[PDB]
Amino acid sequence: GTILIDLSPDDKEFQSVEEEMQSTVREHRDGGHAGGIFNRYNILKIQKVCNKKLWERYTHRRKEVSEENHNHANERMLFHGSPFVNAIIHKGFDERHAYIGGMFGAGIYFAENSSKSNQYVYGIGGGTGCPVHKDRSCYICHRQLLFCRVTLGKSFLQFSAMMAHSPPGHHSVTGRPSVNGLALAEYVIYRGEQAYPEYLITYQIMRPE
Amino acid sequence: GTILIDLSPDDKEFQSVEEEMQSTVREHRDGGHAGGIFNRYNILKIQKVCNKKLWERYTHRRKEVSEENHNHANERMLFHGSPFVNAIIHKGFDERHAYIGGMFGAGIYFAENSSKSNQYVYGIGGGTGCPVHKDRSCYICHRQLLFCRVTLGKSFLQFSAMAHSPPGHHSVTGRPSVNGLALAEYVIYRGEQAYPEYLITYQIMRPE
Ligand SMILES: C[C@]1(c2ccc(-c3nc4ccccc4c(=O)[nH]3)cc2)CNC(=O)N1
């Protein structure tokens, strides 16, 4: 039941999503090993992801979490990179989309930094890079990220020196880098129904000049 | 310089062009937002586009490409949809017919799927639909597509879900990498590498 609607580059909505992408690129401590070497993206397309059933699944869970957290959904827009983006937009998030060995427990991970999510587009650690060239820093092949609506509820704050259940009385974990002060937060949910894949962004990383 | 010659529905040439039009319809990931909801067309007319100057411009360029690519023009018949089909058939393709924001750069885009070109008849994203009813899925208004002769030469293969061609290439091929049912799309960067051979007038048909 999913349909994808192209946004025009002249639309404020497109422009706002692009600015969130570009403005949250940072340097990574791997020197680009996983996601490649770049300071900015070439945005090729931004689509709205429309699925009535997945939307209702999301809003029903958001309502439950909101009431449990004293009428506060604590809803965010966050990036998600994955080799299973095509499955996610059609079937929704579920246990198959978790990062079992993630530092804040076995759940589904999201980032404030677009460039953090870019590290997972070709798998954990960037896998072997793009299919065609086996290049984690490929400037040719098209990549996709999701920009998702995520319900955090009561979030457990975990400072970090950079499917499971949530901490008791918590609906998510907030992983907050405490050493690199330019690194933004990462977030973990333990129920697929707490995220909706609202935008599908197609892009290339750009070689610095 | 352009004249349009009507083909009879009994002509084998009409029949072969209609079959390519109908047989290359697919479902689109927008659920019909841009192009409308349909599985087939009502073909109203097919006309041959005859212009001596435009044809000679095409064949001159085709020979240049062929000579740069081991005597192989790599010539295809592909669909083109555009709000400017009337300018195209009278004056030829040029930089004003390019899709500046296309996924493979600013060039002139063609499709194997007739239904992909149908999404552009009323503009990028289907614009605001037909002039009369403002409906992207209008079943009443007459639409036009071009079925064009296109020189690809050495084509750059882009896997995926006016500028210049990549150096050492004469076109780009957009290979579909997600939708298993999509056919290829193609971009040229010189208007002289396409000739608008057939003008097809049609309606999209409402599914039963
Ligand atoms: C599903 C998959 C996986 C792993 C990690 C991510 C991922 N991990 C992150 C970790 C931190 C911040 C963002 C992300 C992010 O956007 N995506 C996504 C998918 C791929 N293989 C696997 O075992 N787990």
Ligand SMILES: C[C@]1(c2ccc(-c3nc4ccccc4c(=O)[nH]3)cc2)CNC(=O)N1
């Ligand atoms: C001239 C125009 C335009 C844009 C895209 C197309 C077009 N784009 C395609 C993209 C992929 C496949 C086919 C086509 C196709 O048949 N036509 C045609 C005209 C219309 N407005 C504009 O700025 N560029």
Ligand SMILES: [Zn+2]
């Ligand atoms: Zn590549």
Ligand SMILES: [Zn+2]
């Ligand atoms: Zn109409």
